[PDB]
Swiss-Prot record, chain A:
Homotrimer. This is Divalent-cation tolerance protein CutA. One of its GO terms (biological process) is response to copper ion. The lineage of its organism: Bacteria, Pseudomonadati, Pseudomonadota, Gammaproteobacteria, Enterobacterales. NCBIfam families: PRK10645.1 (NF007930). Involved in resistance toward heavy metals.
UniProtKB/Swiss-Prot annotation, chain B:
The keyword Metal-binding applies. Disulfide bonds: none annotated. Pfam families: CutA1. Its cofactor is Cu cation. It comes from Escherichia coli (strain K12). It is found in: Cytoplasm. The lineage of its organism: Bacteria, Pseudomonadati, Pseudomonadota, Gammaproteobacteria, Enterobacterales. GO terms for cellular component: cytoplasm; protein-containing complex. This is Divalent-cation tolerance protein CutA. It comes from the Bacteria.
């Protein structure tokens, strides 16, 4: 167990297009389920579906939140996302700048 | 099986797509996101090097991370490619199940 | 290649964002020269959304992914913050659980 100084986490999610990504971000940010969202459009996603190699353009999303809100955030993202089962993963943040983390935590209240 | 995210790079989109297709076919990863147009910076013997790279983000499980890393390394055009594993501490239950159901 | 049971590491990745490519390259160059980071990947074309003073902001920035170790994470963050043109820049540290020992070993050798 690595030593951690914060309950903050990073959420990785993918959206089908830029318009969807911006709306999903605006939504969860507005409901204070995330403090910030970074969108990287024009990415290429590869995966198998029914035995066929799929290749589609997607938007990589990186959202910042905390453990206390990770479940609510995923539920919200999933519900508004057009896909039934979109990529929704949470990575742990072990450390960060104190001022940024303070703002991140306050943004969720 | 706990899930993980693997960060790796490829010189160009063609190579990134080829490596991704290979590991996905061998069921060593469930999905691969490629972000071309990235710039890599690092020092080498006192000289600042700058290179163009395609950032890869592969999704798999701890039980497959070793096989995935070895496969990416063996087919990689680079001698010392970036290959890092990041832990996934939580995720949507259904997506996590899909990830596992896609691996060997 | 060594597996997670036969090798270990204290490597971490740092996520930070910069306003533009010129600033990102300068920030990266600085911390790399100081051996506070071993490598840095810059991804341009990143859109950042967040509320600031009660208003939704939308900035077009560069996503930086820096590689370092727990031993240098604190110094790296202070260095990035000091040179960053932002007041409260995004600076987060994620733990690395495993990786290619050749790459991990190279990173370590490139640090203070």
């Amino acid at each position: 167990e690595k030593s951690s100084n914060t309950a903050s986490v990073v959420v990785l999610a993918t959206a089908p297009d830029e318009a969807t990504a911006q709306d999903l971000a605006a939504k969860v940010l507005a409901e204070k389920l995330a403090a910030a969202a970074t969108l990287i459009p024009g990415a290429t996603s590869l995966y198998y579906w029914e035995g066929k190699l799929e290749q589609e353009y997607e938007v990589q999303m990186i959202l910042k939140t905390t453990v206390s809100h990770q479940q609510a955030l995923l539920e919200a993202l999933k519900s508004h996302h057009p896909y039934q089962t979109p990529e929704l993963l949470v990575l742990p943040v072990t450390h960060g700048d104190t001022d940024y983390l303070s703002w991140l935590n306050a943004s969720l209240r």
